[PDB]
Every structure is written in structure tokens, then in C-alpha cells.
Amino acid sequence: TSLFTTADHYHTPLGPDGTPHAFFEALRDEAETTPIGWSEAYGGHWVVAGYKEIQAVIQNTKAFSNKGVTFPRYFELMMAGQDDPVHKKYRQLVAKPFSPEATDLFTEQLRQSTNDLIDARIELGEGDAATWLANEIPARLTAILLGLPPEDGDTYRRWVWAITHVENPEEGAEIFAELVAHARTLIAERRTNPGNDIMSRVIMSKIDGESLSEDDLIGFFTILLLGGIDNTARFLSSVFWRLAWDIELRRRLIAHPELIPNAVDELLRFYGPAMVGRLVTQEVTVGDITMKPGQTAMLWFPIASRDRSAFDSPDNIVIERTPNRHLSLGHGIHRCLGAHLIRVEARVAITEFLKRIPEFSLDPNKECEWLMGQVAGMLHVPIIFPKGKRLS
Ligand code: HEM
Ligand SMILES: [Cl-]
């Protein structure tokens, strides 16, 4: 028997600790023999698990297409769901607006908003770190980047959750219509009165004589919400969970805050939420396997992140690991636009949380829960801590 035959990113067996990592470790071991396997799930598809094999797929932009990023398919994501030439036109237009120098101007606002969120429950001595913090931080960050009051993020959070959970397509269309109406109002304001926020920057961007249309700008807003918020939330939730029980990791980050950036990269390797599809467009051989047009290949980044040929001691969080060429933020032409942003955001989140609440643990009377799928990680992380004080 092979673990590939029933591999299913929405149904990953969970271990006693609550995560899929025992299963991932077992699949990584099998991938040393069979780095690309056939799963019978979703009508049949390739599971690409070896690090070299994922790299070979993801570097191939001739035989694979990002029209297949979402799988199963039951609307185009700007850049993430597109191929060249349109992908490249959009990426060039947003490159400088979303540069590290530009997004770094928002760091101190992010730090303030993170402390404001912590204030909400610090006096209570309990909370769900995923619902209270991890889900809220990226949504408030989005609002901050757009020049809006941070609490406007609460609406973004609600939309993203609703869009991804409603069963009725008419209801889904109503929610998406709210989101689009907001984007149009924001765009009109930023066009008439440009500022220094990311939307103003994207509006003014011009490349080879051309600018983004209103539809393209709505698309950009949409991918910030639908491509950024859940990935970040699930990653941060997993990190908060790990810090709640891993007292040795925790004490080291408190004693050596200069190690937090390298630790963020190591936590990305270990808890990276994403698994992404590719549609096969031309016949192509990768290793021992020949893929055929119309098939789907799923890139199981978490397995590649544990490949012993790529990482020594892959099952350990070695916070000093460097370099760290993990695939959790992709690789090549679709590499995460948010890659710098989320590294800074995770540093701030960890730093402020451990500064405000250095003593905490998982709540023994409530359950954690791991969310499976293409964006995976802890969904509920109930913690307890000694009651503390609001900064405001
Ligand atoms: C921890 C949080 C995040 C993770 C793990 C993550 C992961 C990824 C991965 C793996 C890819 C490559 C997809 C592929 O190869 O098809 C990607 C692409 C992308 N991400 Fe992120 N992401 C995160 C946060 C964000 C945020 C906050 C933004 C907002 C800017 C963002 C925007 C994008 C966009 C626009 C792309 C497509 C880029 C392109 O196609 O050129 N992501 N992300
Ligand atoms: Cl910091």
C-alpha cells in the first residue's frame, strides 16, 4: 500500500497532537522512493512531494498553468491564478507599489494595532489565540495598508470567512457584491485624493505606458483579501499554538529577540499553510512520471519542506538554520507577493505577544482544531494566561 493512493489535502490524518505532521513525516519517508504519486482522490491527480520535483514543476511555465491553482474546482485570482503575459503585466505594475520599502512604512501602525488587539482579552486570562489575534492581525494590516482605520479589517475578515463557507452560490454572490462595492468606493477616493497608502501607489503605477483599470484594481483588492488574510491567519494560529506548548522554543525567543527573524523563516518551513495546484497543459515528464494534458498536479509544499536531501534534521525547528530555502512562499515567477510583508508581520506579532503575555499555555478544558485544505493550519487555539493589563 501507498500513502499516495488516498492522499487528500482536505482529509489529512491528524495525530494525537492535533496536526497532520505525523502523516506528513510518513509521506515524506515514502517520497524518498516515490516523490510523485498518484492519488485517486478528486477523480485522480498527481501529488508532488519531493523538493526537487516541486522545483521542477514550479519552474516549468510551459507545460503547467496556474489556471489550475484551486483544486478541486467546484472567477480568476489576480496573478495567482493567471499565466503570462497577463500575470507578468500585473506583477510588474504592483512590484514597486508593494515593495519592502513601501510596506515597511506601516510597521509601527501594525505594532500598535497588534497591541490594541491584545488589549481586548489580556484582562480576562483566556482567549482563542486564533480568533482573537491570528484572524484579526492580517485583516487589520490590510486596512492599514489601504489607508483605512484598522477596525475596517473586521469587515474584511467577515467577508473572507463567509465567501469561503457559504453553500448557496447566490449568497456567495451577495457577499462578493458587498466586497466589490467597497473596493469601488475606496478606489474612487484614492484616485481623486491620492496618498501614500498601497492603493494610491498601485493606482499611480505605470509600466510601458499603461496603468491598471478599475476592474484590475478591484482584482488587486480582492487578492489582498482572498490571497493574504487566510494564509496569514492560519500560519500565525499555528505559530501561537506551537509557542503555547513549546516552552523551550518560547524561552529562546524571549532571551534572544535578534533570532526572531530567522525563527520566523524556520516556522514558515514547518507550518507553511499552502498547497497549490497546477494544471498540466502539455505532456511532460518529471522524474519517473509522465503527466498528460488536463491532469492536475498538487504541490505538497509541507512534504518538500521536510525533504532530508534539502534540509538536515528536517523534523526539528532549528531556529538558527541558515540558509533556509523552503518553498512555503513559493518559488519562481509566482513567488508570494507578500513574502516580505508576512515575515515582518510575523516578527511583530510574535514580539508583541511574547512581550505582553510571556506566560501562557493551551487551555485544558477547550479543544484546539486544525483546518485542512489548500490553506491549512490551526483554526482554534484556546489559551490561558495570568490576567494582565491593557496598554490603553
Ligand atoms: C503566511 C502567509 C502567506 C503564505 C504562506 C503565502 C503563500 C504563497 C504561495 C505558496 C504562493 C505561490 C503560489 C503559486 O506558486 O501558485 C503565493 C503567491 C501569492 N501571494 Fe502569498 N502567501 C501568504 C501571504 C500573502 C499576503 C499577505 C499577500 C498580500 C500581498 C499575498 C499575495 C500573494 C499573491 C498576489 C501571490 C501570487 C503572485 C504571483 O502570481 O506572481 N500572499 N503565496
Ligand atoms: Cl519587531
PDB file of N, CA and C in Angstrom, residues 172-256:
ATOM      1  N   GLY A 172     -23.223  33.638  -1.861  1.00  0.00           N
ATOM      2  CA  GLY A 172     -21.830  33.953  -2.132  1.00  0.00           C
ATOM      3  C   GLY A 172     -21.711  35.158  -3.047  1.00  0.00           C
ATOM      4  N   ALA A 173     -22.550  35.216  -4.073  1.00  0.00           N
ATOM      5  CA  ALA A 173     -22.567  36.385  -4.951  1.00  0.00           C
ATOM      6  C   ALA A 173     -22.970  37.669  -4.245  1.00  0.00           C
ATOM      7  N   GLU A 174     -23.868  37.587  -3.260  1.00  0.00           N
ATOM      8  CA  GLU A 174     -24.232  38.793  -2.500  1.00  0.00           C
ATOM      9  C   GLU A 174     -23.067  39.330  -1.661  1.00  0.00           C
ATOM     10  N   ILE A 175     -22.324  38.443  -1.021  1.00  0.00           N
ATOM     11  CA  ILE A 175     -21.198  38.847  -0.209  1.00  0.00           C
ATOM     12  C   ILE A 175     -20.145  39.442  -1.118  1.00  0.00           C
ATOM     13  N   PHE A 176     -19.861  38.785  -2.242  1.00  0.00           N
ATOM     14  CA  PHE A 176     -18.820  39.295  -3.131  1.00  0.00           C
ATOM     15  C   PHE A 176     -19.230  40.678  -3.662  1.00  0.00           C
ATOM     16  N   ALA A 177     -20.520  40.889  -3.906  1.00  0.00           N
ATOM     17  CA  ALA A 177     -21.008  42.202  -4.318  1.00  0.00           C
ATOM     18  C   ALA A 177     -20.764  43.302  -3.263  1.00  0.00           C
ATOM     19  N   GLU A 178     -20.859  42.961  -1.974  1.00  0.00           N
ATOM     20  CA  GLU A 178     -20.514  43.920  -0.910  1.00  0.00           C
ATOM     21  C   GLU A 178     -19.037  44.313  -0.973  1.00  0.00           C
ATOM     22  N   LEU A 179     -18.202  43.302  -1.147  1.00  0.00           N
ATOM     23  CA  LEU A 179     -16.766  43.490  -1.208  1.00  0.00           C
ATOM     24  C   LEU A 179     -16.403  44.402  -2.411  1.00  0.00           C
ATOM     25  N   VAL A 180     -16.956  44.103  -3.579  1.00  0.00           N
ATOM     26  CA  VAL A 180     -16.709  44.896  -4.754  1.00  0.00           C
ATOM     27  C   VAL A 180     -17.194  46.342  -4.607  1.00  0.00           C
ATOM     28  N   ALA A 181     -18.370  46.554  -4.009  1.00  0.00           N
ATOM     29  CA  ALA A 181     -18.879  47.895  -3.788  1.00  0.00           C
ATOM     30  C   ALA A 181     -17.944  48.724  -2.901  1.00  0.00           C
ATOM     31  N   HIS A 182     -17.420  48.107  -1.856  1.00  0.00           N
ATOM     32  CA  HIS A 182     -16.440  48.768  -1.010  1.00  0.00           C
ATOM     33  C   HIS A 182     -15.183  49.104  -1.795  1.00  0.00           C
ATOM     34  N   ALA A 183     -14.682  48.149  -2.571  1.00  0.00           N
ATOM     35  CA  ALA A 183     -13.466  48.383  -3.340  1.00  0.00           C
ATOM     36  C   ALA A 183     -13.666  49.583  -4.282  1.00  0.00           C
ATOM     37  N   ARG A 184     -14.828  49.672  -4.933  1.00  0.00           N
ATOM     38  CA  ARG A 184     -15.083  50.769  -5.876  1.00  0.00           C
ATOM     39  C   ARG A 184     -15.076  52.127  -5.173  1.00  0.00           C
ATOM     40  N   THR A 185     -15.652  52.198  -3.981  1.00  0.00           N
ATOM     41  CA  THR A 185     -15.647  53.448  -3.224  1.00  0.00           C
ATOM     42  C   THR A 185     -14.206  53.822  -2.833  1.00  0.00           C
ATOM     43  N   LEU A 186     -13.438  52.845  -2.369  1.00  0.00           N
ATOM     44  CA  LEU A 186     -12.056  53.077  -1.964  1.00  0.00           C
ATOM     45  C   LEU A 186     -11.242  53.583  -3.165  1.00  0.00           C
ATOM     46  N   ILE A 187     -11.361  52.885  -4.286  1.00  0.00           N
ATOM     47  CA  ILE A 187     -10.627  53.233  -5.491  1.00  0.00           C
ATOM     48  C   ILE A 187     -10.963  54.658  -5.937  1.00  0.00           C
ATOM     49  N   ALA A 188     -12.239  55.027  -5.927  1.00  0.00           N
ATOM     50  CA  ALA A 188     -12.626  56.358  -6.374  1.00  0.00           C
ATOM     51  C   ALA A 188     -12.001  57.428  -5.476  1.00  0.00           C
ATOM     52  N   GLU A 189     -11.968  57.169  -4.170  1.00  0.00           N
ATOM     53  CA  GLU A 189     -11.397  58.138  -3.212  1.00  0.00           C
ATOM     54  C   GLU A 189      -9.886  58.265  -3.395  1.00  0.00           C
ATOM     55  N   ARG A 190      -9.209  57.144  -3.571  1.00  0.00           N
ATOM     56  CA  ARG A 190      -7.767  57.167  -3.692  1.00  0.00           C
ATOM     57  C   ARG A 190      -7.356  57.768  -5.033  1.00  0.00           C
ATOM     58  N   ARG A 191      -8.167  57.584  -6.070  1.00  0.00           N
ATOM     59  CA  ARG A 191      -7.901  58.220  -7.359  1.00  0.00           C
ATOM     60  C   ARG A 191      -7.993  59.734  -7.299  1.00  0.00           C
ATOM     61  N   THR A 192      -9.000  60.238  -6.604  1.00  0.00           N
ATOM     62  CA  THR A 192      -9.239  61.686  -6.590  1.00  0.00           C
ATOM     63  C   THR A 192      -8.323  62.411  -5.614  1.00  0.00           C
ATOM     64  N   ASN A 193      -7.942  61.737  -4.531  1.00  0.00           N
ATOM     65  CA  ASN A 193      -7.120  62.308  -3.463  1.00  0.00           C
ATOM     66  C   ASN A 193      -6.007  61.301  -3.117  1.00  0.00           C
ATOM     67  N   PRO A 194      -5.005  61.143  -3.995  1.00  0.00           N
ATOM     68  CA  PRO A 194      -4.008  60.104  -3.727  1.00  0.00           C
ATOM     69  C   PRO A 194      -3.166  60.399  -2.505  1.00  0.00           C
ATOM     70  N   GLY A 195      -2.844  59.342  -1.776  1.00  0.00           N
ATOM     71  CA  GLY A 195      -1.991  59.431  -0.615  1.00  0.00           C
ATOM     72  C   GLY A 195      -0.772  58.537  -0.762  1.00  0.00           C
ATOM     73  N   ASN A 196      -0.274  58.050   0.370  1.00  0.00           N
ATOM     74  CA  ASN A 196       0.945  57.249   0.408  1.00  0.00           C
ATOM     75  C   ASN A 196       0.669  55.772   0.687  1.00  0.00           C
ATOM     76  N   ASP A 197      -0.603  55.445   0.799  1.00  0.00           N
ATOM     77  CA  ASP A 197      -1.015  54.060   1.029  1.00  0.00           C
ATOM     78  C   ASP A 197      -0.821  53.205  -0.212  1.00  0.00           C
ATOM     79  N   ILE A 198      -0.956  51.887  -0.023  1.00  0.00           N
ATOM     80  CA  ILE A 198      -0.682  50.971  -1.105  1.00  0.00           C
ATOM     81  C   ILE A 198      -1.652  51.140  -2.266  1.00  0.00           C
ATOM     82  N   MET A 199      -2.921  51.408  -1.993  1.00  0.00           N
ATOM     83  CA  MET A 199      -3.861  51.547  -3.104  1.00  0.00           C
ATOM     84  C   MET A 199      -3.526  52.771  -3.944  1.00  0.00           C
ATOM     85  N   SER A 200      -3.200  53.892  -3.308  1.00  0.00           N
ATOM     86  CA  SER A 200      -2.807  55.086  -4.067  1.00  0.00           C
ATOM     87  C   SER A 200      -1.612  54.775  -4.937  1.00  0.00           C
ATOM     88  N   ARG A 201      -0.668  54.022  -4.393  1.00  0.00           N
ATOM     89  CA  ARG A 201       0.550  53.696  -5.130  1.00  0.00           C
ATOM     90  C   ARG A 201       0.227  52.822  -6.345  1.00  0.00           C
ATOM     91  N   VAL A 202      -0.611  51.814  -6.141  1.00  0.00           N
ATOM     92  CA  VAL A 202      -0.957  50.918  -7.230  1.00  0.00           C
ATOM     93  C   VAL A 202      -1.716  51.676  -8.341  1.00  0.00           C
ATOM     94  N   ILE A 203      -2.594  52.593  -7.946  1.00  0.00           N
ATOM     95  CA  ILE A 203      -3.353  53.411  -8.898  1.00  0.00           C
ATOM     96  C   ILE A 203      -2.428  54.225  -9.793  1.00  0.00           C
ATOM     97  N   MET A 204      -1.371  54.777  -9.201  1.00  0.00           N
ATOM     98  CA  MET A 204      -0.486  55.672  -9.952  1.00  0.00           C
ATOM     99  C   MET A 204       0.591  54.950 -10.742  1.00  0.00           C
ATOM    100  N   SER A 205       0.703  53.645 -10.541  1.00  0.00           N
ATOM    101  CA  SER A 205       1.741  52.882 -11.200  1.00  0.00           C
ATOM    102  C   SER A 205       1.519  52.834 -12.692  1.00  0.00           C
ATOM    103  N   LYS A 206       2.592  53.032 -13.443  1.00  0.00           N
ATOM    104  CA  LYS A 206       2.509  52.996 -14.899  1.00  0.00           C
ATOM    105  C   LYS A 206       3.706  52.231 -15.415  1.00  0.00           C
ATOM    106  N   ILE A 207       3.458  51.321 -16.351  1.00  0.00           N
ATOM    107  CA  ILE A 207       4.521  50.472 -16.904  1.00  0.00           C
ATOM    108  C   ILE A 207       4.278  50.355 -18.407  1.00  0.00           C
ATOM    109  N   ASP A 208       5.324  50.639 -19.188  1.00  0.00           N
ATOM    110  CA  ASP A 208       5.244  50.593 -20.656  1.00  0.00           C
ATOM    111  C   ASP A 208       4.046  51.416 -21.162  1.00  0.00           C
ATOM    112  N   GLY A 209       3.779  52.509 -20.461  1.00  0.00           N
ATOM    113  CA  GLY A 209       2.735  53.445 -20.823  1.00  0.00           C
ATOM    114  C   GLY A 209       1.360  53.169 -20.243  1.00  0.00           C
ATOM    115  N   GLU A 210       1.167  52.027 -19.573  1.00  0.00           N
ATOM    116  CA  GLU A 210      -0.161  51.583 -19.171  1.00  0.00           C
ATOM    117  C   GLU A 210      -0.362  51.530 -17.649  1.00  0.00           C
ATOM    118  N   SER A 211      -1.603  51.695 -17.222  1.00  0.00           N
ATOM    119  CA  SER A 211      -1.985  51.562 -15.826  1.00  0.00           C
ATOM    120  C   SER A 211      -3.076  50.515 -15.622  1.00  0.00           C
ATOM    121  N   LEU A 212      -3.247  50.078 -14.392  1.00  0.00           N
ATOM    122  CA  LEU A 212      -4.350  49.166 -14.062  1.00  0.00           C
ATOM    123  C   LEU A 212      -5.711  49.826 -14.284  1.00  0.00           C
ATOM    124  N   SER A 213      -6.643  49.076 -14.847  1.00  0.00           N
ATOM    125  CA  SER A 213      -8.008  49.546 -14.966  1.00  0.00           C
ATOM    126  C   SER A 213      -8.728  49.413 -13.630  1.00  0.00           C
ATOM    127  N   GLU A 214      -9.932  49.984 -13.540  1.00  0.00           N
ATOM    128  CA  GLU A 214     -10.732  49.818 -12.330  1.00  0.00           C
ATOM    129  C   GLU A 214     -10.980  48.340 -12.027  1.00  0.00           C
ATOM    130  N   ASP A 215     -11.326  47.558 -13.046  1.00  0.00           N
ATOM    131  CA  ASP A 215     -11.505  46.121 -12.844  1.00  0.00           C
ATOM    132  C   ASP A 215     -10.251  45.449 -12.290  1.00  0.00           C
ATOM    133  N   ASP A 216      -9.092  45.846 -12.791  1.00  0.00           N
ATOM    134  CA  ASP A 216      -7.829  45.307 -12.321  1.00  0.00           C
ATOM    135  C   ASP A 216      -7.566  45.720 -10.856  1.00  0.00           C
ATOM    136  N   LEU A 217      -7.917  46.959 -10.515  1.00  0.00           N
ATOM    137  CA  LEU A 217      -7.770  47.457  -9.162  1.00  0.00           C
ATOM    138  C   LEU A 217      -8.691  46.716  -8.173  1.00  0.00           C
ATOM    139  N   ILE A 218      -9.905  46.398  -8.618  1.00  0.00           N
ATOM    140  CA  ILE A 218     -10.824  45.609  -7.817  1.00  0.00           C
ATOM    141  C   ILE A 218     -10.192  44.204  -7.621  1.00  0.00           C
ATOM    142  N   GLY A 219      -9.588  43.678  -8.692  1.00  0.00           N
ATOM    143  CA  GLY A 219      -8.925  42.385  -8.650  1.00  0.00           C
ATOM    144  C   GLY A 219      -7.774  42.383  -7.660  1.00  0.00           C
ATOM    145  N   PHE A 220      -7.054  43.506  -7.583  1.00  0.00           N
ATOM    146  CA  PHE A 220      -5.938  43.607  -6.667  1.00  0.00           C
ATOM    147  C   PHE A 220      -6.415  43.636  -5.215  1.00  0.00           C
ATOM    148  N   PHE A 221      -7.439  44.432  -4.958  1.00  0.00           N
ATOM    149  CA  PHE A 221      -8.061  44.459  -3.648  1.00  0.00           C
ATOM    150  C   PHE A 221      -8.509  43.036  -3.270  1.00  0.00           C
ATOM    151  N   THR A 222      -9.117  42.343  -4.227  1.00  0.00           N
ATOM    152  CA  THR A 222      -9.667  41.029  -3.951  1.00  0.00           C
ATOM    153  C   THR A 222      -8.553  40.052  -3.548  1.00  0.00           C
ATOM    154  N   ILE A 223      -7.421  40.091  -4.229  1.00  0.00           N
ATOM    155  CA  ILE A 223      -6.380  39.128  -3.913  1.00  0.00           C
ATOM    156  C   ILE A 223      -5.733  39.463  -2.578  1.00  0.00           C
ATOM    157  N   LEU A 224      -5.699  40.728  -2.160  1.00  0.00           N
ATOM    158  CA  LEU A 224      -5.214  41.041  -0.811  1.00  0.00           C
ATOM    159  C   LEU A 224      -6.072  40.293   0.214  1.00  0.00           C
ATOM    160  N   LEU A 225      -7.403  40.317   0.035  1.00  0.00           N
ATOM    161  CA  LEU A 225      -8.299  39.678   0.967  1.00  0.00           C
ATOM    162  C   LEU A 225      -8.263  38.182   0.840  1.00  0.00           C
ATOM    163  N   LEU A 226      -8.493  37.672  -0.361  1.00  0.00           N
ATOM    164  CA  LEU A 226      -8.664  36.245  -0.600  1.00  0.00           C
ATOM    165  C   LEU A 226      -7.363  35.468  -0.736  1.00  0.00           C
ATOM    166  N   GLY A 227      -6.260  36.158  -1.005  1.00  0.00           N
ATOM    167  CA  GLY A 227      -4.956  35.505  -1.073  1.00  0.00           C
ATOM    168  C   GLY A 227      -4.052  35.772   0.131  1.00  0.00           C
ATOM    169  N   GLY A 228      -4.351  36.795   0.917  1.00  0.00           N
ATOM    170  CA  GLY A 228      -3.490  37.136   2.026  1.00  0.00           C
ATOM    171  C   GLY A 228      -4.007  36.783   3.403  1.00  0.00           C
ATOM    172  N   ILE A 229      -5.263  37.104   3.670  1.00  0.00           N
ATOM    173  CA  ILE A 229      -5.744  37.049   5.023  1.00  0.00           C
ATOM    174  C   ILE A 229      -5.773  35.610   5.596  1.00  0.00           C
ATOM    175  N   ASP A 230      -6.376  34.645   4.897  1.00  0.00           N
ATOM    176  CA  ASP A 230      -6.441  33.287   5.432  1.00  0.00           C
ATOM    177  C   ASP A 230      -5.075  32.626   5.547  1.00  0.00           C
ATOM    178  N   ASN A 231      -4.188  32.816   4.570  1.00  0.00           N
ATOM    179  CA  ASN A 231      -2.850  32.235   4.667  1.00  0.00           C
ATOM    180  C   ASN A 231      -2.150  32.753   5.910  1.00  0.00           C
ATOM    181  N   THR A 232      -2.209  34.057   6.119  1.00  0.00           N
ATOM    182  CA  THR A 232      -1.536  34.632   7.249  1.00  0.00           C
ATOM    183  C   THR A 232      -2.168  34.161   8.570  1.00  0.00           C
ATOM    184  N   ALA A 233      -3.502  34.149   8.614  1.00  0.00           N
ATOM    185  CA  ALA A 233      -4.198  33.753   9.835  1.00  0.00           C
ATOM    186  C   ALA A 233      -3.860  32.325  10.250  1.00  0.00           C
ATOM    187  N   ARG A 234      -3.875  31.399   9.305  1.00  0.00           N
ATOM    188  CA  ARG A 234      -3.609  30.017   9.629  1.00  0.00           C
ATOM    189  C   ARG A 234      -2.135  29.841  10.040  1.00  0.00           C
ATOM    190  N   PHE A 235      -1.216  30.522   9.347  1.00  0.00           N
ATOM    191  CA  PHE A 235       0.178  30.470   9.760  1.00  0.00           C
ATOM    192  C   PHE A 235       0.374  30.992  11.199  1.00  0.00           C
ATOM    193  N   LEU A 236      -0.147  32.190  11.463  1.00  0.00           N
ATOM    194  CA  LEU A 236       0.019  32.757  12.806  1.00  0.00           C
ATOM    195  C   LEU A 236      -0.664  31.893  13.876  1.00  0.00           C
ATOM    196  N   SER A 237      -1.816  31.316  13.558  1.00  0.00           N
ATOM    197  CA  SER A 237      -2.515  30.444  14.522  1.00  0.00           C
ATOM    198  C   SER A 237      -1.626  29.253  14.897  1.00  0.00           C
ATOM    199  N   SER A 238      -1.004  28.649  13.882  1.00  0.00           N
ATOM    200  CA  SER A 238      -0.117  27.518  14.103  1.00  0.00           C
ATOM    201  C   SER A 238       1.088  27.924  14.954  1.00  0.00           C
ATOM    202  N   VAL A 239       1.615  29.114  14.704  1.00  0.00           N
ATOM    203  CA  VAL A 239       2.741  29.620  15.488  1.00  0.00           C
ATOM    204  C   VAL A 239       2.340  29.865  16.953  1.00  0.00           C
ATOM    205  N   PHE A 240       1.183  30.473  17.177  1.00  0.00           N
ATOM    206  CA  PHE A 240       0.719  30.706  18.537  1.00  0.00           C
ATOM    207  C   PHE A 240       0.507  29.375  19.279  1.00  0.00           C
ATOM    208  N   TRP A 241      -0.041  28.381  18.602  1.00  0.00           N
ATOM    209  CA  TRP A 241      -0.191  27.064  19.145  1.00  0.00           C
ATOM    210  C   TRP A 241       1.156  26.470  19.551  1.00  0.00           C
ATOM    211  N   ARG A 242       2.122  26.537  18.648  1.00  0.00           N
ATOM    212  CA  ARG A 242       3.420  25.959  18.928  1.00  0.00           C
ATOM    213  C   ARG A 242       4.078  26.666  20.123  1.00  0.00           C
ATOM    214  N   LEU A 243       3.995  27.991  20.202  1.00  0.00           N
ATOM    215  CA  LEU A 243       4.588  28.732  21.320  1.00  0.00           C
ATOM    216  C   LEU A 243       3.862  28.456  22.644  1.00  0.00           C
ATOM    217  N   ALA A 244       2.595  28.074  22.589  1.00  0.00           N
ATOM    218  CA  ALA A 244       1.806  27.795  23.790  1.00  0.00           C
ATOM    219  C   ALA A 244       2.315  26.557  24.510  1.00  0.00           C
ATOM    220  N   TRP A 245       2.728  25.516  23.789  1.00  0.00           N
ATOM    221  CA  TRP A 245       3.211  24.309  24.452  1.00  0.00           C
ATOM    222  C   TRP A 245       4.730  24.116  24.425  1.00  0.00           C
ATOM    223  N   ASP A 246       5.398  24.691  23.430  1.00  0.00           N
ATOM    224  CA  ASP A 246       6.842  24.506  23.223  1.00  0.00           C
ATOM    225  C   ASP A 246       7.609  25.528  24.047  1.00  0.00           C
ATOM    226  N   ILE A 247       7.779  25.196  25.330  1.00  0.00           N
ATOM    227  CA  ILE A 247       8.328  26.130  26.308  1.00  0.00           C
ATOM    228  C   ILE A 247       9.797  26.401  26.054  1.00  0.00           C
ATOM    229  N   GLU A 248      10.452  25.472  25.366  1.00  0.00           N
ATOM    230  CA  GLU A 248      11.858  25.651  25.046  1.00  0.00           C
ATOM    231  C   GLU A 248      12.057  26.649  23.882  1.00  0.00           C
ATOM    232  N   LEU A 249      11.288  26.491  22.821  1.00  0.00           N
ATOM    233  CA  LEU A 249      11.298  27.491  21.765  1.00  0.00           C
ATOM    234  C   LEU A 249      10.953  28.866  22.334  1.00  0.00           C
ATOM    235  N   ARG A 250       9.916  28.925  23.147  1.00  0.00           N
ATOM    236  CA  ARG A 250       9.433  30.197  23.668  1.00  0.00           C
ATOM    237  C   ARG A 250      10.524  30.929  24.459  1.00  0.00           C
ATOM    238  N   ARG A 251      11.192  30.223  25.370  1.00  0.00           N
ATOM    239  CA  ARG A 251      12.155  30.902  26.221  1.00  0.00           C
ATOM    240  C   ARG A 251      13.300  31.431  25.370  1.00  0.00           C
ATOM    241  N   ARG A 252      13.665  30.722  24.299  1.00  0.00           N
ATOM    242  CA  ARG A 252      14.776  31.152  23.445  1.00  0.00           C
ATOM    243  C   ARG A 252      14.426  32.441  22.688  1.00  0.00           C
ATOM    244  N   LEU A 253      13.187  32.560  22.213  1.00  0.00           N
ATOM    245  CA  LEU A 253      12.781  33.779  21.506  1.00  0.00           C
ATOM    246  C   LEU A 253      12.682  34.979  22.423  1.00  0.00           C
ATOM    247  N   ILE A 254      12.337  34.751  23.683  1.00  0.00           N
ATOM    248  CA  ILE A 254      12.321  35.819  24.685  1.00  0.00           C
ATOM    249  C   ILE A 254      13.734  36.253  25.056  1.00  0.00           C
ATOM    250  N   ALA A 255      14.636  35.289  25.185  1.00  0.00           N
ATOM    251  CA  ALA A 255      16.029  35.581  25.604  1.00  0.00           C
ATOM    252  C   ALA A 255      16.859  36.176  24.459  1.00  0.00           C
ATOM    253  N   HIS A 256      16.514  35.812  23.223  1.00  0.00           N
ATOM    254  CA  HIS A 256      17.262  36.227  22.035  1.00  0.00           C
ATOM    255  C   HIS A 256      16.344  36.797  20.947  1.00  0.00           C
TER     256      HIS A 256
END
